[PDB]
């Protein structure tokens, strides 16, 4: 279950109320950004050098969010 | 007199009307976000990876920016 990732990364889900409040929770993120083009997607910026750790997994961020679609997509970037 | 900072940074100056879009022109800048905590200041986050670069020095960005009174103050961290 446990979700790692050293980059920023999108958030999609099918229902993105509680998205920004839930994210700004975690330690490691710089800020998160809405696409004013499409509700579902969010960025979340991870402050330089930090882990994003979920150690529940994607599970543990739709728990909190209440959105059992959401998902994550890593921006992975070589260096 | 080159400028360069591989991390996120602080401007401040006293007439920041040009400072978002100068910065936009750059593609090591991921975002720019205005400060909240004074209207003097905007933070402004390079892309992972990346290494923000003005061959002229902070001049450089005095001019672009049409304010002479600019600084630039890099934010930190520990790879």
């Given at each position: 279950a446990t979700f790692?990732?050293?980059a920023d990364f999108l958030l999609v889900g099918d229902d993105t109320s509680r998205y920004e409040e839930v994210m700004?929770?975690?330690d490691t993120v710089e800020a998160v950004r809405k696409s004013d083009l499409?509700?579902?997607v969010y960025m979340v910026?991870?402050?330089q050098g930090s882990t994003f750790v979920l150690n529940g997994?994607?599970?543990e961020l739709r728990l909190?969010?209440?959105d059992s679609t959401l998902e994550i997509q890593p921006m992975i970037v070589p260096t």
């Open positions: 790692q990732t050293d700004k929770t975690f499409d509700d579902r910026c991870l402050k997994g994607i599970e909190l969010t209440g």
